[PDB]
Amino acid sequence: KCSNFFANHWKGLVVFLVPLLCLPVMLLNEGAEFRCMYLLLVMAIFWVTEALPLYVTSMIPIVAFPIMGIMSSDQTCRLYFKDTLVMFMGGIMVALAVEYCNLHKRLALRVIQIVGCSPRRLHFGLIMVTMFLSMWISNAACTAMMCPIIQAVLEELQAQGVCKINHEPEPPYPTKITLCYYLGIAYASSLGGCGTIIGTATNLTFKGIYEARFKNSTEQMDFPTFMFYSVPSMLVYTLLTFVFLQWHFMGLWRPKSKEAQEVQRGREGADVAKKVIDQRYKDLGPMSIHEIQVMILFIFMVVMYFTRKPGIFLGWADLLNSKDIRNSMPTIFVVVMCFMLPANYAFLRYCTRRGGPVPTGPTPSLITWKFIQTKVPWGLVFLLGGGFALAEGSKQSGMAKLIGNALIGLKVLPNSVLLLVVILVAVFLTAFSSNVAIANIIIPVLAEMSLAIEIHPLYLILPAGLACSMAFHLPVSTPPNALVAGYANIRTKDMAIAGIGPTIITIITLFVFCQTWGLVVYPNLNSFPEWAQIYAAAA
Amino acid sequence: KCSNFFANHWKGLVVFLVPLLCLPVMLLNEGAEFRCMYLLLVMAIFWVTEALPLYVTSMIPIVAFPIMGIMSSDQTCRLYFKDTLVMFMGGIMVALAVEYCNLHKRLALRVIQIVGCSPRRLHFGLIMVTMFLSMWISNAACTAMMCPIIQAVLEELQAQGVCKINHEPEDEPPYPTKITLCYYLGIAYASSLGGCGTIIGTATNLTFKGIYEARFKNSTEQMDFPTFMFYSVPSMLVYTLLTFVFLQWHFMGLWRPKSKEAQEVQRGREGADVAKKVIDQRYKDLGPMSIHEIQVMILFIFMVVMYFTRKPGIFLGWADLLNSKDIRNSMPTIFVVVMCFMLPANYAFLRYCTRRGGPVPTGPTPSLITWKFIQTKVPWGLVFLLGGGFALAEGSKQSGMAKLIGNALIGLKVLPNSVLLLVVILVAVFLTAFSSNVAIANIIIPVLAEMSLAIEIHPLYLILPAGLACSMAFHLPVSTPPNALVAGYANIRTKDMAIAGIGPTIITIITLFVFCQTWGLVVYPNLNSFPEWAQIYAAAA
Ligand SMILES: CCCCCCCCCCCCCCCCCCCC(=O)O[C@H](COC(=O)CCCCCCCCCCCCCC)COP(=O)(O)OCCN
Ligand SMILES: CCCCCCCCCCCCCCCCCCCC(=O)O[C@H](COC(=O)CCCCCCCCCCCCCC)COP(=O)(O)OCCN
Ligand SMILES: *[C@@H]1O[C@H](CO)[C@@H](O)[C@H](O)[C@H]1NC(C)=O
Ligand SMILES: *[C@@H]1O[C@H](CO)[C@@H](O)[C@H](O)[C@H]1NC(C)=O
User: Cross-referenced InterPro entries, in alphabetical order (chain B)?
Assistant: First the structure.
């Protein structure tokens, strides 16, 4: 009678108790830093527990800071909707423009055709396409985008009798082949998210927190440098994840395995069937001018990102040196040009052209605002802004001093083991809650800790920021896992066991690359830079 | 043939040509102010003609200001999503919380019980309530407050067969019917008009009162809370009554029995008794206010009170008590929004904790509102629209638009005092149609003060009419936040709103030009004369 009470109403218990239980933090101290600490604990517990929706929890600073002495109500609101957040929202809008006209389907099917259609070749192609797409699209959107293709080819194969999707007789148990495919798509989404600033919200969160805390940093996490740093590691552990998934499910390096015979009979007599369904499902027709325009706009946007401030030459944002331009001009420019440009050019038949029949009305633009209004996760505005505002309040109130001086006991550890334990803590934390919440909670703490110790702040922030996105064990860990578990009726035990591979691979790959090749990207990780010394002296 | 080309593809033609045709204003002048003037002209043309979606057009400043060198990109984005914008979005969310539970249905049924279920009487009652309420609260707050109530009233009238909410019909939202336009534009216009009643009615009044007081100390005439109300309320009542009459004439064909709109209203007038029996039956079959509705109503009342009791000028207000950091009205609004998620819907969970029987809740108890509902119903483009207004105002200040527009106003000194008053009112009305009211007040009020000092007339005689005129904007959704909120809630095309706003504009201009010269003399006897302190100020100048 009481157990099910805690089963059903534990979230309300957390909401009602946590502020009261954390009240002694304010009541037993004097400075505003302890009020900010009370707020930080309450918000962090709400984020990890998800007692309140993350978007709703993120609006707490707007109430708390003005009531306390932290900042005025105007500054707190302006902390929301920063420049980088506008860039991310515009990136989401452009990704929706790409999803409109089904450019993603065309690209995915074309690449799957280019790669072989053998079951292992199919799996490799699916992972590669999903990773490349998730580099520019939200992970959940990319997962729900790629799942239909593998689903359809699976019903085709099962109808042909080659293999069975679910075990013969609770929802049906998925077989190892379909588990491999779906888990591969989900893990590919998660891994490909880490390779770009706009790939996932977590990257933007920790990049923005680092840029806000350290404005004087010589090392900058702009779009091209971050992509340079992160792409090789992404490729390495994506390939290794694919290899592990093949070995665990499809019996790689096990010619005598039962699963190996499954793949073998899928190779003979099913390659033709699944190829045929690939071209049939590629009935999108010839490349329309609409898709071509969307592709050109997207490529132009990326090129503008790379040309903002290169060291090799000047480029824009240095020709226009009157003010800072900062990567929001290209994105919003592309978003607006999506609405300006038409999608037919059939109206040109009026001006001395034969063509065909004239249009009956106004030609549609590349995208409709109804589509944007209904497929943008607008709560990310509040979530990212709340992270930024909490970081700024922690800086201003005095949380930095308290936490840094409290956690100075880690100075005795060597840098390598400190990096290892930071990565392990980040992975363990993000295994149970949303990645953005974990980044918001830990990144300011890591910055202040690395200031207290004599450690370059990036050396701990960047590997941990990447590690916050490596969630593979539970459906609650990240939206793609929940989507896949819903699609394929994946039992939590199977996913938890299969996540051992990607977790270890990502941990080792990060721990090796951030020490070897991260030095190649930024040559100053090992030392303590001058600006870090100035910041430490100030705080 | 080629005529059909213009008929079908004129929007894209405007999009492609207007930047090119307006480029000369940039080219022939060598100033960042003229660059900003080009940007403003292009955005205004796109707004009036609706070549692009309004929300998309509001995105242009992010691209334009950094490129044009007016202001940095990080600053430009932060001018979006200001404190006031958070207040607006929170107000919309609280309105959605009211709409989630059928509280708006209850309010509409009670109001219809009170009034008598006649479209004219109901419209007049809602207009009066909105006016009196916006006398004390921010205009956008009252508009968002009243929108669900108006929706419920229209739904009830539709159910009784009195009218249709929307025209019968691919992606564009349904076109509102005449009566829907009448009611929604009515509450928007009523908010705008009632905001001019009191000092705390809207931020524009506080702004220009502060400007006058700071510029002119040692002044015999003051605009404190009682005197300003005594001066403004009669003229405001005249605005509201005449605007109501015009809205009735234009939409339901008042004084026009031949019009088809009159016939349907006359048909709806029939059978009032059976209508009221049906209405109070529909009120009765609704159960008593559930704890969901009671809690959301208590939260809404608390939010309204906190709005009113912050720096009212009559007494202390909680803002001055918590003066360590500047707290504004987004605090109570976001607090209410958060509490709408924290508080439960029912309380059966503790009911079975008391061993008082009853069915134990089988699952988590829902909160007062679900984020899925908010993500779907909030018009999120309002963020870009209202932020675009704010950022465009700030860019006008920084670039040099403010100084340039003021320099043009100096030339009006040659006109005679009555003609000068009319011209100033017209200029204020025209300017406020493209910018936030506070911005236009900041643009024109100091110039008016200096010009009045130079021409030796009482500064209030010009400041009050123009200070009030800065708030009457009824032609475009960008002109004032209430219009944008109404257009978002009920999809009102800019053509209909622009053609409907002719009435209120002319009405307000005429009644101001009359009531200043007549009634202000009753309020301020020294209004026509040039007081001694004004003489010493001019001598100092
Ligand atoms: C020097 C400065 C000092 C400053 C001090 C500030 C202190 C206050 C800080 C904020 C506190 C907020 C408290 C109000 C919100 C309480 C929410 C309780 C939710 C609730 O009833 O949950 C249920 C269990 O409740 C339970 O087991 C407990 C019973 C709860 C009964 C209602 C309690 C709240 C009454 C109103 C309080 C108003 C406070 C206003 C400030 C299960 O809910 P679920 O999990 O099924 O669903 C949850 C989603 N709906
Ligand atoms: C220091 C000084 C700096 C100065 C800077 C100045 C910048 C000026 C920029 C001007 C150009 C950008 C804005 C216009 C973009 C193109 C708009 C095309 C509109 C269009 O084609 O409309 C159709 C008719 O076009 C026509 O009849 C027009 C002729 C055909 C136009 C074709 C346009 C696409 C190809 C060229 C693109 C060039 C892009 C350059 C950035 C009818 O469309 P509809 O109304 O049926 O449907 C509309 C659905 N939205
Ligand atoms: C920024 O860092 C440089 C060295 O990297 C230092 O010379 C300069 O004083 C710093 N500026 C501030 C404002 O701390
Ligand atoms: C303003 O100050 C001057 C200074 O002598 C004084 O003569 C004048 O009477 C004052 N104005 C009023 C309205 O008292």
Answer: Na/sul_symport_CS, SLC13A/DASS
